Design an enzyme around this catalytic site. Structure first.
Site, PDB file in Angstrom:
ATOM      1  N   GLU A   1      55.989 -44.835  28.850  1.00  7.45           N
ATOM      2  CA  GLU A   1      57.006 -45.437  28.534  1.00  7.45           C
ATOM      3  C   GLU A   1      57.589 -46.770  27.648  1.00  7.45           C
ATOM      4  O   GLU A   1      58.238 -46.641  26.700  1.00  7.45           O
ATOM      5  CB  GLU A   1      57.929 -45.558  29.907  1.00  7.45           C
ATOM      6  CG  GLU A   1      58.262 -44.310  30.456  1.00  7.45           C
ATOM      7  CD  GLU A   1      58.805 -45.050  31.996  1.00  7.45           C
ATOM      8  OE1 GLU A   1      58.817 -46.162  32.596  1.00  7.45           O
ATOM      9  OE2 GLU A   1      59.061 -43.859  32.558  1.00  7.45           O
TER      10      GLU A   1
ATOM     11  N   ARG B   1      30.786 -45.160  48.127  1.00  6.16           N
ATOM     12  CA  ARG B   1      30.947 -46.270  49.168  1.00  6.16           C
ATOM     13  C   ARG B   1      30.802 -45.741  50.344  1.00  6.16           C
ATOM     14  O   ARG B   1      31.583 -44.816  50.479  1.00  6.16           O
ATOM     15  CB  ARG B   1      32.125 -47.535  48.901  1.00  6.16           C
ATOM     16  CG  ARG B   1      31.893 -48.069  48.249  1.00  6.16           C
ATOM     17  CD  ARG B   1      33.737 -49.111  48.245  1.00  6.16           C
ATOM     18  NE  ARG B   1      33.563 -49.920  46.385  1.00  6.16           N
ATOM     19  CZ  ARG B   1      33.229 -50.837  46.412  1.00  6.16           C
ATOM     20  NH1 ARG B   1      32.355 -51.288  46.881  1.00  6.16           N
ATOM     21  NH2 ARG B   1      33.444 -51.225  44.408  1.00  6.16           N
TER      22      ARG B   1
END
Lengths: 251, 250
Positions: B77, B165
């Site tokens: 945009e 993780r």
């Protein structure tokens, strides 16, 4: 006890094991206020978090932001805090001519046009909702008096080329996505959105219950511009419906 | 004219062709205030937009939210409204022991562990910055007195399993990502983050200039924890650097 992004503790949730998860942080308060004793918990990034009570049970309302990556953080951290059931609500455009503005869509499965879903399960795994949540959402949607469509949603990591939009800066769409909207239409896909594949894959592969419901606010195949009144009604109905579905899930 | 998400018009940008794009909307005003005549334009969802002036030229500062999907909307945009150059700033952890908290990383290429990049170019295409932007970021970083690292960043659609993780609700990491941190470490990868692969691929394949600079605020391979003061100082330095890099691009 504490989490990295959401800025709330387990104690803040007051025992809630169900969350309603809209995308837009500005919708969080509105959803919370449909229930009893809404309380603002935290706001950080796209994560605005409220708690409320539904039939005396604590419920969380937490925004997810746009897209799988943002959503995946919220869902993970809510799960760390004991949330096990996730109800996605929003509004959406439809890509089937038979689906009208104001109808509701409950997703039975998502086309995985995302990346985050692959961080939880390989592509062969189905991006499917929990059956009880989908059932509750269908029931709440039908009870609202809306016309309800159960079916497949195409879940894209982009708003533009992945939804085969050409009205863009480059006017180009990558080969993978050229002709893709007609492809999905022919396969009966109901709508595009940007989070369900990540949400549903992540939950279905992680022992969490999730589903998605949405009000239709535009149809890509029908140029006729919907009226502000019908749109307002549709927005309001979508969150009324997700709250009723949550009620149906409480045990 | 009119864009779908950002809530600004081309007129609002006052001719800006360069945007600084942090992830966190809360950083937007802080960046804008380092420049002249900052003005708030709009805030919707994770998109907070300000305009400012740098050496007499209009610049836009616009947050992107977390992840490639959210970033891709903002970049598209802004480009519809005439922006052609995009400078990403933020802070990051590092996965190389020789990278210290307080150092700066300028990304020379990203491992595409995302999905949105594939919506612009097939996986074979390199997630690479514009050379002028990376050069400007390196210069601004060095001039700030920071130690600077040029190198590859691993860009993940997730914070948790895609950065390997295990301290998570399930404690599981999908096969694809098991052992992956050590793999990237051995390949010299400097750090993880969650937007660069999308940004760089999108821009490099669309005729837009882009680059990424980040201040290091934690090191995953080190036990030491940075105090609150070092963090603030690193945040402040990172945005000073990106504005100076922007000055170099204009």
């Amino acid at each position: 006890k504490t989490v990295f992004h959401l800025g709330v503790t387990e104690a803040d949730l007051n025992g809630a094991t169900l969350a309603i998860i809209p995308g837009d942080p500005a919708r969080v308060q509105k959803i919370a206020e449909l229930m009893d004793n809404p309380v603002f918990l935290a706001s950080h990034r796209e994560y605005t978090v409220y708690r409320a009570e539904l039939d005396g049970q604590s419920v969380v309302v937490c925004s997810t932001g746009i897209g799988g990556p943002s959503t995946s953080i919220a869902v993970e951290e809510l799960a760390q805090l004991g949330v096990r059931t996730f109800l996605r609500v929003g509004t959406t455009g439809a890509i089937q001519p038979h689906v009208n503005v104001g109808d509701m869509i409950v997703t039975t499965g998502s086309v995985r046009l995302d990346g985050a879903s692959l961080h939880f399960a390989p592509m062969e795994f189905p991006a499917v909702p929990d059956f009880d949540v989908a059932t509750a959402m269908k029931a709440a949607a039908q009870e609202s008096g809306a016309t309800v469509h159960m079916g497949v949603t195409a879940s894209s990591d982009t708003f533009y080329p992945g939804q085969e939009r050409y009205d863009t800066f480059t006017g180009r769409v990558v080969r993978r996505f050229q002709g893709s909207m007609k492809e999905w239409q022919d396969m009966g896909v109901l709508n595009f959105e940007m989070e369900s594949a990540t949400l549903l894959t992540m939950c279905a592969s992680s022992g969490l219950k999730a589903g998605c419901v949405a009000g239709v606010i535009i149809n890509r195949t029908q140029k006729e511009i919907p009226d502000h009144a019908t749109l307002k009604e549709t927005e309001a109905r979508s969150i009324k419906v997700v709250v009723e579905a949550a009620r149906k899930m409480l045990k």
